[PDB]
Write a protein that holds these residues in place. Structure first.
Motif, PDB file in Angstrom:
ATOM      1  N   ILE A  27     -22.671 -14.499  -1.464  1.00 41.73           N
ATOM      2  CA  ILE A  27     -23.779 -13.685  -1.926  1.00 41.73           C
ATOM      3  C   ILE A  27     -24.345 -14.166  -3.271  1.00 41.73           C
ATOM      4  O   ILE A  27     -25.546 -14.290  -3.461  1.00 41.73           O
ATOM      5  CB  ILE A  27     -23.360 -12.231  -2.098  1.00 41.73           C
ATOM      6  CG1 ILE A  27     -23.158 -11.573  -0.736  1.00 41.73           C
ATOM      7  CG2 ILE A  27     -24.429 -11.440  -2.859  1.00 41.73           C
ATOM      8  CD1 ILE A  27     -24.352 -11.605   0.113  1.00 41.73           C
ATOM      9  N   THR A  29     -29.585 -16.594  -4.576  1.00 43.81           N
ATOM     10  CA  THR A  29     -30.742 -16.884  -5.414  1.00 43.81           C
ATOM     11  C   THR A  29     -30.883 -18.370  -5.743  1.00 43.81           C
ATOM     12  O   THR A  29     -32.004 -18.916  -5.755  1.00 43.81           O
ATOM     13  CB  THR A  29     -30.787 -16.071  -6.698  1.00 43.81           C
ATOM     14  OG1 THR A  29     -29.629 -16.337  -7.500  1.00 43.81           O
ATOM     15  CG2 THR A  29     -30.930 -14.589  -6.374  1.00 43.81           C
ATOM     16  N   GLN A  71     -32.327 -20.043  -2.811  1.00 41.52           N
ATOM     17  CA  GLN A  71     -33.726 -19.765  -2.769  1.00 41.52           C
ATOM     18  C   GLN A  71     -34.434 -20.736  -3.709  1.00 41.52           C
ATOM     19  O   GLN A  71     -35.432 -21.384  -3.332  1.00 41.52           O
ATOM     20  CB  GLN A  71     -33.976 -18.350  -3.261  1.00 41.52           C
ATOM     21  CG  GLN A  71     -35.311 -17.820  -2.815  1.00 41.52           C
ATOM     22  CD  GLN A  71     -35.667 -16.536  -3.505  1.00 41.52           C
ATOM     23  OE1 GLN A  71     -35.205 -16.271  -4.609  1.00 41.52           O
ATOM     24  NE2 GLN A  71     -36.475 -15.710  -2.844  1.00 41.52           N
ATOM     25  N   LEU A  80     -35.902 -12.892  -1.053  1.00 43.01           N
ATOM     26  CA  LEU A  80     -34.452 -12.953  -1.170  1.00 43.01           C
ATOM     27  C   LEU A  80     -33.816 -12.156  -0.050  1.00 43.01           C
ATOM     28  O   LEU A  80     -32.805 -12.566   0.510  1.00 43.01           O
ATOM     29  CB  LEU A  80     -33.969 -12.469  -2.547  1.00 43.01           C
ATOM     30  CG  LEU A  80     -32.478 -12.734  -2.770  1.00 43.01           C
ATOM     31  CD1 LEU A  80     -32.219 -14.227  -2.720  1.00 43.01           C
ATOM     32  CD2 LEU A  80     -32.006 -12.138  -4.084  1.00 43.01           C
TER      33      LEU A  80
END
Ligand SMILES: *[C@H](O)CS/C=C/NC(=O)CCNC(=O)[C@H](O)C(C)(C)COP(=O)(O)OP(=O)(O)OCc1oc(-n2cnc3c(N)ncnc32)c(O)c1OP(=O)(O)O
Ligand SMILES: [Cl-]
Ligand SMILES: [Cl-]
Ligand SMILES: [Cl-]
Ligand SMILES: [Cl-]
Ligand SMILES: [Cl-]
Ligand SMILES: [Cl-]
Ligand SMILES: [Cl-]
Ligand SMILES: [Cl-]
Ligand SMILES: [Cl-]
Ligand SMILES: [Cl-]
Ligand SMILES: [Cl-]
Ligand SMILES: [Cl-]
Ligand SMILES: [Cl-]
Ligand SMILES: [Cl-]
Ligand SMILES: [Cl-]
Ligand SMILES: [Cl-]
Ligand SMILES: [Cl-]
Lengths: 4, 718, 153
Positions: free
Chosen positions: C8, C12, C15, C28
């Motif tokens: 997790i 980001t 991304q 996201l």
């Protein structure tokens, strides 16, 4: 890569 | 109260909400309202419809005026819950849903909703009560059991978690599927609960017993090795870790673990058996040479002559292959500044060997062989080295040597631009990066680097034209608006910083605010997963989600944006001309206060007229957004015009403060803020906290204290 | 480099890697949807400082084409600086093994734009994918995609  | 013609109309109101297109709905309510205005639910249904197609306070009024009329009624509380939720007012939606349920105890969906709200707010206690009440309502579905367990685990109530999972697992004596993957995760979660309650010894045993039920073989083996290392079952760890390297021999931690399991390395530092430590790595070269790790990793810990021999073998390896990544790889060894000198001297000698011959050093001519295009890569390495070390002159000579050799190679120009950046020559860094980009028009990356360098040089529009080559321009505000939609943090930050340093404040605030929005969006995205995660059964991953979220704002990018905003809000408070985002030359004339009232008055009249045009321009932008619902109301300027910037700076500070101890700049910003607020005791404590860490002779600390002294002794007079 | 399963807390950074390297991007939430839905299929390459430098973002077909379970790469890329090392090939093998072992995928498929010489030379020749066919105007700018499809057998 897929296109959304 | 109680009419039978309106009932079929009251229902069609609700049904129209359910089905969206709120237009029809209103027409089925309005008749019964302007002639019966005292029916709360009617007023309530009205509101959410007016809220739904928007907007917004029109609805909140009818809801409120309805809810205050019916005490009473779950329907009212429910729609107040809906709008608060839609508007992201989560603490209030919860409160509405509890009251809604306390008045309609048999409506279970209220609880299914409340659970989401309470999970978001981290009300773990109340969550557990809600999850429990849902599990009682429907023990049929596994997910409700998982959600109560997880909730309880989140409260540290591990035993209660264990009993829940245990109880559920026994009610399936037959099976075995079930989902299978649900079961696999249920077990790994259960093994987490045990580790958390009965410690490692028990958890190991349980893990060994669930091996057949666990599909995620990497989780099983990784979890197993951790345990086996913890219990000093070294021999078993040895074999397990080999199973992991077999699967993936590129996972650094596996190596440090195998070393630990051989006892060649402590859990912290690598001692002892320096000789056998090497040997293992050498054996690990038999772990198919398809892995660089066995030769690269020991470089971190080796020293002296054994380092020289191996770093030499490593560098030549990567040079002969023409790997452009060779310096970025070795770069991390430079943490000690002894190896740096060794590597520097080694590859310097490489370049001059390669002078007359095609062989490194001197004794290599005895083993013969040659190489044609290693100089390029040697030169390129040297160029990156000397840029890193700060030479710049030496560095630039080396890229030039490389570019003269092969002028079509993108990386060479990338490096030359950086060297220029470091020399302080932003305009030519930008030109050189554009040339780099030109050498590869199909690559979004080099495009991005180019735009960054443009932003660094305060060429905003050029940058936006440049990235327009790769964005989805269809909406909103072209390339830059798409970059915001796609949560591109770096571009918004670099753009904002650029606007800030040209004193284009409204734009700077804008870009920074987009960073705020991106983070807020991230914080909010977990919401649906407080339901969806239990439906998939991804319990350990859900747990990771919850703790990532708990500190999502503790980020360099968010910091930078908040910092930037506060500084501008400070300027907004200080200078009465700041709000007109004056051009840099006008900003400096007005800031030096040496000009007369004749020139000063003229500058303001101009600043005002220019703001008018920007405002006029923003209206046209809105018209364009709208004619394409949810708009954007300050395409630029609403922020910068605030009636009180301190308050805004305060809001910007809120999410910086919890992380103050590791980011003491938060505390100093705070001090500067409360100094301006004339609230000196709150100011001095923040300044002291900042002084404790980093402080005393810290530049930012003393200049804040000087500023502190200047305002506190200004409150009085004598 | 360090290749390892995606967590997790490094979504980001996946991304951001996607943003730098590809015209096709997602918010996201869509990454989160991958993590919760298929928590072990995605992998990540990190630099000495721990930041994401390459990734594969994989999934299993939600609506199974003809009832047979199969994987889909939805994205893979590497920062320009760490390219030509083997990062992508290795990320792809890790992700594929998991599709098979955890979900029983009988094959995997992906999309590449017709002009992406790099990606084609990676799947077709060095990961042994087949060209299933061509999908007209698949990308937003109108370029055609090759549907690539690797059968596990
Ligand atoms: C849907 O997501 C599919 S299409 C999208 C792919 N991503 C991108 O196109 C953008 C960004 N990332 C990249 O461009 C990378 O180059 C990719 C992801 C394509 C691969 O990274 P990597 O450099 O690590 O590739 P690899 O691990 O070495 O894989 C084997 C390999 O590929 C090449 N190779 C591909 N293309 C070229 C070109 N044009 N020139 C030289 N070499 C190329 C190799 O030489 C590889 O190794 P090999 O020894 O040949 O097997
Ligand atoms: Cl719609
Ligand atoms: Cl409360
Ligand atoms: Cl509590
Ligand atoms: Cl408590
Ligand atoms: Cl509470
Ligand atoms: Cl307990
Ligand atoms: Cl034992
Ligand atoms: Cl082995
Ligand atoms: Cl840079
Ligand atoms: Cl930098
Ligand atoms: Cl649920
Ligand atoms: Cl579902
Ligand atoms: Cl920071
Ligand atoms: Cl970008
Ligand atoms: Cl989604
Ligand atoms: Cl970086
Ligand atoms: Cl980067």
């Amino acid at each position: 890569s897929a296109s959304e | 109260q109680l009419s039978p013609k309106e009932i079929t109309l009251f229902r069609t109101a609700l049904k129209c909400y359910e089905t969206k297109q709120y237009k029809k709905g209103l027409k089925a309510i309005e008749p019964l309202l302007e002639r019966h205005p005292e029916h709360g639910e009617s007023l309530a249904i009205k509101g959410i419809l007016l809220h739904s197609l928007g907007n917004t306070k029109e609805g909140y009024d009818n809801v409120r005026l309805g809810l205050r009329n019916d005490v009473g009624s779950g329907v009212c509380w429910h729609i107040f819950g809906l709008i608060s939720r839609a508007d992201k007012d989560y603490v209030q939606a919860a409160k509405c849903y509890i009251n809604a349920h306390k008045l309609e105890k048999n409506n279970s969906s209220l609880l299914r909703d409340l659970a989401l709200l309470q999970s978001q707010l981290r009300q773990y206690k109340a969550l557990a009560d809600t999850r429990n009440a849902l599990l009682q309502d429907n023990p049929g579905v596994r997910a409700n059991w998982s959600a109560l367990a997880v909730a309880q685990f989140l409260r540290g109530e591990y035993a209660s978690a264990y009993k829940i999972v245990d109880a559920f697992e026994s009610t399936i004596n037959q099976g075995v599927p079930v989902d299978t993957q649900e079961e696999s995760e249920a077990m790994l979660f259960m093994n987490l609960v045990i580790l958390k309650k009965d410690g490692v010894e028990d958890a190991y045993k349980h893990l060994l017993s669930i091996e057949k039920k666990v599909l995620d073989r990497v989780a099983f083996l990784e979890t197993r090795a951790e345990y086996e290392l913890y219990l000093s079952k070294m021999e078993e760890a040895k074999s397990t870790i080999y199973l992991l390297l077999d699967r993936n021999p590129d996972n650094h931690q596996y190596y440090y673990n195998l070393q630990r399991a051989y006892g060649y390395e402590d859990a912290s530092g690598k001692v002892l058996d320096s000789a056998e430590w090497l040997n293992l790595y050498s054996q690990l070269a038999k772990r198919y040479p398809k892995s660089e790790c066995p030769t690269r990793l020991p470089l971190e810990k080796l020293e002296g002559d054994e380092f020289l021999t191996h770093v030499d073998l490593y560098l030549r390896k990567k040079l002969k292959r023409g790997i452009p990544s060779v310096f970025v790889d070795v770069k991390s060894l430079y943490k000690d500044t002894k190896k740096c000198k060794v590597v520097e001297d080694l590859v310097s000698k490489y370049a001059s060997s390669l002078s007359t011959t095609n062989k490194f050093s001197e004794d290599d001519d005895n083993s013969q062989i040659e190489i044609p295009t290693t100089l390029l890569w040697t030169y390129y390495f040297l160029a990156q080295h000397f840029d890193h070390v700060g030479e710049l002159e030496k560095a630039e000579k080396y890229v030039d040597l490389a570019i003269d050799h092969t002028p079509t190679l993108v990386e060479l120009f990338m490096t030359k631009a950086r060297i220029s950046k470091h020399k302080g020559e932003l305009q030519t860094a930008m030109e050189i990066m554009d040339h780099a980009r030109k050498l590869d028009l199909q690559d979004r990356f080099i495009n991005g680097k180019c735009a960054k360098y443009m932003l660094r040089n305060d060429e905003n529009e050029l940058a936006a034209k440049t990235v327009s080559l790769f964005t989805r321009n269809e909406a909103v505000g072209g390339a830059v608006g798409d970059l915001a939609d796609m949560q591109c943090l770096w571009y918004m930050l670099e753009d904002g910083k650029s606007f800030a340093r040209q004193k284009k404040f409204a734009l700077a605030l804008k870009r920074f605010s987009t960073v705020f929005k991106i983070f807020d969006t991230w914080a909010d995205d977990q919401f649906d997963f407080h339901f969806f995660a239990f439906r998939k059964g991804s319990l350990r991953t859900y747990l990771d989600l919850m703790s990532w979220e708990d500190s999502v704002y503790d980020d360099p990018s968010f910091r930078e944006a908040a910092q930037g905003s506060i500084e501008i809000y400070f300027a907004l408070f200080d200078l009465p001309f700041a709000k007109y985002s004056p051009k840099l030359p006008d900003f400096e004339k007005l800031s030096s206060g040496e000009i007369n009232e004749e020139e000063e008055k003229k500058i303001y009249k101009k600043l005002k007229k220019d703001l008018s045009k920007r405002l006029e321009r923003a209206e046209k932008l809105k018209e364009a957004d709208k004619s394409r619902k949810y708009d954007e109301d300050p395409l630029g300027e609403n922020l910068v015009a605030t009636s009180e910037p301190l308050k805004e700076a305060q809001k910007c500070l809120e999410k910086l403060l919890p992380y103050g101890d590791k980011n003491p700049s938060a505390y100093i910003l705070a001090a500067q803020l409360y100094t301006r607020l004339k609230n000196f005791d709150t100011a001095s404590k923040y300044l002291e906290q900042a002084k404790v860490i980093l402080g005393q002779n810290d530049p930012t600390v003393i200049s804040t204290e000087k500023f502190y002294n200047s305002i506190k002794t200004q409150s009085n007079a004598a | 480099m360090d290749i390892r399963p995606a967590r997790i807390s490094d979504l980001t950074g996946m991304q951001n890697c996607n943003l730098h390297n590809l015209p096709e991007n997602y918010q996201l939430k869509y990454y989160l949807y991958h993590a919760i839905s298929w928590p072990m299929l995605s992998y990540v390459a990190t630099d000495p400082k721990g930041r994401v430098v390459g990734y594969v973002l994989a999934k299993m077909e939600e609506e199974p084409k003809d009832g047979i379970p199969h994987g889909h790469i939805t994205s893979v890329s590497v920062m320009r600086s760490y390219r030509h090392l083997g990062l992508a090939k290795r990320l792809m093998v890790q992700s594929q093994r998991a599709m098979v072992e955890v979900y029983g995928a009988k094959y995997m498929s992906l999309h590449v734009r017709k002009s992406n010489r790099a990606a084609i030379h990676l799947y077709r020749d060095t990961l042994q994918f087949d060209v299933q066919g061509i999908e007209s105007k698949y990308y937003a700018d109108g370029e055609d995609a090759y549907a690539m499809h690797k059968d596990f057998s």
